[PDB]
Design an enzyme around this catalytic site. Structure first.
Site: not given
Ligand SMILES: O=C(N[C@H]1c2ccccc2C[C@H]1O)[C@H](CCc1ccccc1)[C@@H](O)[C@H](O)[C@@H](CCc1ccccc1)C(=O)N[C@H]1c2ccccc2C[C@H]1O
Lengths: 99, 99
Positions: B25-27
Protein backbone atom coordinates in the site's frame (compact mmCIF):
# COMPACT_ATOMS: atom_id res chain seq x y z
CA UNK A 1 8.10 8.48 -14.38
CA UNK A 2 9.52 6.37 -11.55
CA UNK A 3 8.39 7.29 -8.05
CA UNK A 4 10.19 6.18 -4.89
CA UNK A 5 8.36 5.94 -1.56
CA UNK A 6 10.62 7.75 0.92
CA UNK A 7 7.95 10.44 0.98
CA UNK A 8 4.24 10.30 0.13
CA UNK A 9 3.68 9.75 -3.61
CA UNK A 10 1.85 13.04 -4.19
CA UNK A 11 1.29 14.38 -7.69
CA UNK A 12 -0.68 17.20 -9.24
CA UNK A 13 -4.00 16.37 -10.83
CA UNK A 14 -6.30 18.54 -12.90
CA UNK A 15 -10.07 18.27 -12.60
CA UNK A 16 -12.81 20.75 -13.35
CA UNK A 17 -10.13 23.08 -14.65
CA UNK A 18 -8.45 23.13 -11.23
CA UNK A 19 -5.09 21.91 -9.97
CA UNK A 20 -5.07 19.82 -6.78
CA UNK A 21 -2.61 17.48 -5.09
CA UNK A 22 -3.50 13.81 -4.78
CA UNK A 23 -1.96 10.61 -3.39
CA UNK A 24 -1.15 7.68 -5.69
CA UNK A 25 -2.61 4.90 -3.55
CA UNK A 26 -2.26 1.22 -4.55
CA UNK A 27 -4.15 0.26 -1.39
CA UNK A 28 -7.27 2.13 -2.50
CA UNK A 29 -9.75 0.30 -4.72
CA UNK A 30 -11.40 3.57 -5.74
CA UNK A 31 -10.56 7.23 -6.24
CA UNK A 32 -11.95 9.65 -3.65
CA UNK A 33 -11.53 13.43 -3.60
CA UNK A 34 -12.30 16.07 -0.97
CA UNK A 35 -15.64 17.88 -1.11
CA UNK A 36 -16.03 19.67 -4.42
CA UNK A 37 -18.60 20.26 -7.13
CA UNK A 38 -18.83 17.91 -10.10
CA UNK A 39 -21.35 17.77 -12.97
CA UNK A 40 -24.22 15.34 -13.37
CA UNK A 41 -26.13 13.11 -10.98
CA UNK A 42 -24.45 11.04 -8.29
CA UNK A 43 -25.12 7.64 -6.73
CA UNK A 44 -24.55 6.68 -3.09
CA UNK A 45 -21.65 4.51 -2.00
CA UNK A 46 -20.04 3.39 1.22
CA UNK A 47 -16.29 2.83 1.34
CA UNK A 48 -14.39 1.29 4.22
CA UNK A 49 -10.90 2.08 5.42
CA UNK A 50 -8.83 1.29 8.49
CA UNK A 51 -11.02 3.34 10.83
CA UNK A 52 -14.45 2.41 9.51
CA UNK A 53 -16.79 3.51 6.73
CA UNK A 54 -17.73 6.88 5.26
CA UNK A 55 -20.55 7.83 2.90
CA UNK A 56 -19.46 9.29 -0.42
CA UNK A 57 -21.04 10.54 -3.63
CA UNK A 58 -20.18 8.61 -6.79
CA UNK A 59 -19.89 10.41 -10.13
CA UNK A 60 -19.21 8.48 -13.34
CA UNK A 61 -17.23 9.25 -16.50
CA UNK A 62 -15.32 12.16 -14.99
CA UNK A 63 -12.33 13.61 -16.83
CA UNK A 64 -9.23 13.81 -14.68
CA UNK A 65 -5.64 14.56 -15.63
CA UNK A 66 -2.97 12.83 -13.53
CA UNK A 67 0.62 13.94 -14.08
CA UNK A 68 -0.30 14.93 -17.63
CA UNK A 69 -2.11 11.65 -18.29
CA UNK A 70 -5.79 11.99 -19.15
CA UNK A 71 -8.16 9.50 -17.53
CA UNK A 72 -11.94 9.21 -17.56
CA UNK A 73 -13.63 7.19 -14.89
CA UNK A 74 -15.48 6.94 -11.62
CA UNK A 75 -14.67 9.54 -8.98
CA UNK A 76 -15.98 9.51 -5.41
CA UNK A 77 -16.44 12.70 -3.39
CA UNK A 78 -16.62 12.92 0.38
CA UNK A 79 -14.97 13.51 3.79
CA UNK A 80 -11.64 11.89 2.89
CA UNK A 81 -8.52 13.22 4.70
CA UNK A 82 -6.67 13.76 1.40
CA UNK A 83 -7.32 13.34 -2.32
CA UNK A 84 -6.70 9.70 -3.25
CA UNK A 85 -6.07 8.24 -6.70
CA UNK A 86 -6.99 4.56 -6.40
CA UNK A 87 -6.60 1.47 -8.58
CA UNK A 88 -9.51 2.25 -10.89
CA UNK A 89 -7.55 5.21 -12.28
CA UNK A 90 -4.01 3.94 -11.68
CA UNK A 91 -4.68 1.13 -14.16
CA UNK A 92 -5.86 3.67 -16.75
CA UNK A 93 -2.52 5.47 -16.71
CA UNK A 94 -0.64 2.17 -16.78
CA UNK A 95 0.80 2.44 -13.29
CA UNK A 96 2.60 -0.61 -11.86
CA UNK A 97 4.49 -1.52 -8.68
CA UNK A 98 8.08 -2.67 -9.22
CA UNK A 99 10.90 -4.10 -7.09
CA UNK B 1 8.75 -8.47 -10.07
CA UNK B 2 6.23 -6.14 -11.71
CA UNK B 3 2.76 -5.91 -10.21
CA UNK B 4 -0.24 -4.63 -12.18
CA UNK B 5 -3.16 -3.02 -10.35
CA UNK B 6 -6.14 -4.76 -11.97
CA UNK B 7 -6.53 -6.53 -8.62
CA UNK B 8 -5.42 -5.66 -5.10
CA UNK B 9 -1.62 -6.08 -4.84
CA UNK B 10 -1.54 -8.85 -2.24
CA UNK B 11 1.65 -10.77 -1.49
CA UNK B 12 2.84 -13.37 1.00
CA UNK B 13 4.90 -12.12 3.91
CA UNK B 14 6.75 -13.95 6.67
CA UNK B 15 6.81 -12.49 10.17
CA UNK B 16 7.41 -14.29 13.44
CA UNK B 17 7.82 -17.52 11.52
CA UNK B 18 4.22 -17.08 10.41
CA UNK B 19 3.12 -16.74 6.79
CA UNK B 20 0.44 -14.18 5.96
CA UNK B 21 -1.11 -12.26 3.06
CA UNK B 22 -0.60 -8.50 2.92
CA UNK B 23 -1.40 -5.49 0.78
CA UNK B 24 1.42 -3.44 -0.80
CA UNK B 25 0.00 0.00 0.00
CA UNK B 26 1.73 3.17 -1.28
CA UNK B 27 -1.00 5.19 0.43
CA UNK B 28 -0.06 3.88 3.88
CA UNK B 29 2.67 5.72 5.82
CA UNK B 30 3.18 2.83 8.26
CA UNK B 31 2.78 -0.94 8.29
CA UNK B 32 -0.11 -2.40 10.26
CA UNK B 33 -1.01 -6.04 10.81
CA UNK B 34 -4.03 -7.70 12.39
CA UNK B 35 -3.85 -8.69 16.07
CA UNK B 36 -0.90 -11.00 16.74
CA UNK B 37 1.87 -11.67 19.24
CA UNK B 38 5.28 -10.08 18.83
CA UNK B 39 8.35 -10.01 21.11
CA UNK B 40 9.70 -6.97 22.92
CA UNK B 41 8.17 -3.84 24.40
CA UNK B 42 5.56 -1.81 22.53
CA UNK B 43 4.17 1.74 22.59
CA UNK B 44 0.56 2.82 22.07
CA UNK B 45 -0.17 4.75 18.88
CA UNK B 46 -3.15 6.17 17.06
CA UNK B 47 -3.26 6.00 13.26
CA UNK B 48 -5.85 7.61 11.05
CA UNK B 49 -7.26 6.65 7.70
CA UNK B 50 -10.57 6.56 5.90
CA UNK B 51 -13.18 6.12 8.62
CA UNK B 52 -11.17 7.66 11.42
CA UNK B 53 -8.52 6.52 13.88
CA UNK B 54 -7.72 3.22 15.57
CA UNK B 55 -5.40 2.45 18.48
CA UNK B 56 -2.54 0.09 17.66
CA UNK B 57 0.53 -1.29 19.42
CA UNK B 58 3.86 -0.15 18.00
CA UNK B 59 6.83 -2.53 17.86
CA UNK B 60 10.19 -1.37 16.50
CA UNK B 61 13.03 -3.28 14.82
CA UNK B 62 10.83 -6.12 13.58
CA UNK B 63 12.14 -8.39 10.83
CA UNK B 64 9.81 -9.14 7.92
CA UNK B 65 10.15 -11.01 4.66
CA UNK B 66 8.25 -9.57 1.70
CA UNK B 67 8.29 -11.75 -1.42
CA UNK B 68 11.64 -13.20 -0.40
CA UNK B 69 13.08 -9.78 0.42
CA UNK B 70 14.08 -9.12 4.02
CA UNK B 71 13.22 -5.79 5.61
CA UNK B 72 13.52 -4.29 9.08
CA UNK B 73 11.23 -1.64 10.49
CA UNK B 74 8.47 -0.47 12.76
CA UNK B 75 5.38 -2.64 12.71
CA UNK B 76 2.00 -1.68 14.13
CA UNK B 77 -0.49 -4.28 15.35
CA UNK B 78 -4.17 -3.63 15.85
CA UNK B 79 -7.78 -3.98 14.66
CA UNK B 80 -7.03 -3.54 10.96
CA UNK B 81 -9.34 -5.52 8.64
CA UNK B 82 -6.43 -6.33 6.31
CA UNK B 83 -2.66 -6.63 6.68
CA UNK B 84 -0.98 -3.55 5.21
CA UNK B 85 2.64 -3.14 4.11
CA UNK B 86 3.24 0.62 4.11
CA UNK B 87 5.96 2.95 2.83
CA UNK B 88 8.31 2.48 5.79
CA UNK B 89 8.93 -1.09 4.54
CA UNK B 90 8.22 -0.76 0.79
CA UNK B 91 11.26 1.53 0.54
CA UNK B 92 13.50 -1.15 2.09
CA UNK B 93 12.72 -3.66 -0.63
CA UNK B 94 13.24 -1.06 -3.35
CA UNK B 95 9.61 -0.78 -4.37
CA UNK B 96 8.72 1.96 -6.87
CA UNK B 97 5.62 3.20 -8.67
CA UNK B 98 6.09 3.38 -12.46
CA UNK B 99 4.05 4.77 -15.36
O1 LIG C 1 -8.23 2.37 3.40
C1 LIG C 1 -7.69 1.87 2.40
N1 LIG C 1 -8.37 1.48 1.27
C2 LIG C 1 -9.79 1.61 1.06
C3 LIG C 1 -10.18 2.76 0.16
C4 LIG C 1 -9.60 4.10 0.01
C5 LIG C 1 -10.18 5.04 -0.95
C6 LIG C 1 -11.33 4.64 -1.75
C7 LIG C 1 -11.91 3.31 -1.62
C8 LIG C 1 -11.33 2.39 -0.66
C9 LIG C 1 -11.75 0.98 -0.34
C10 LIG C 1 -10.49 0.43 0.36
O2 LIG C 1 -9.59 -0.19 -0.56
C11 LIG C 1 -6.20 1.61 2.44
C12 LIG C 1 -5.80 0.60 3.43
C13 LIG C 1 -6.06 -0.82 3.08
C14 LIG C 1 -7.49 -1.36 3.34
C15 LIG C 1 -8.18 -2.13 2.30
C16 LIG C 1 -9.52 -2.65 2.53
C17 LIG C 1 -10.20 -2.40 3.79
C18 LIG C 1 -9.54 -1.63 4.84
C19 LIG C 1 -8.20 -1.11 4.63
C20 LIG C 1 -5.41 2.98 2.51
O3 LIG C 1 -4.28 2.99 1.58
C21 LIG C 1 -6.08 4.32 2.39
O4 LIG C 1 -6.51 4.45 1.03
C22 LIG C 1 -5.15 5.51 2.90
C23 LIG C 1 -5.67 6.88 2.54
C24 LIG C 1 -4.72 8.01 2.50
C25 LIG C 1 -4.50 8.83 3.80
C26 LIG C 1 -3.23 9.51 3.99
C27 LIG C 1 -2.93 10.30 5.18
C28 LIG C 1 -3.93 10.43 6.23
C29 LIG C 1 -5.22 9.77 6.07
C30 LIG C 1 -5.50 8.99 4.88
C31 LIG C 1 -5.02 5.46 4.44
O5 LIG C 1 -5.93 5.17 5.22
N2 LIG C 1 -3.77 5.80 4.87
C32 LIG C 1 -3.22 5.92 6.20
C33 LIG C 1 -2.57 4.74 6.89
C34 LIG C 1 -2.88 3.33 6.58
C35 LIG C 1 -2.19 2.27 7.31
C36 LIG C 1 -1.20 2.60 8.35
C37 LIG C 1 -0.89 4.00 8.66
C38 LIG C 1 -1.59 5.05 7.92
C39 LIG C 1 -1.47 6.29 8.03
C40 LIG C 1 -1.99 6.80 6.84
O6 LIG C 1 -1.33 6.96 6.00
Amino acid sequence: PQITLWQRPLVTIKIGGQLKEALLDTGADDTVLEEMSLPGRWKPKMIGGIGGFIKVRQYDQILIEICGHKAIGTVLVGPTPVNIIGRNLLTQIGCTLNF
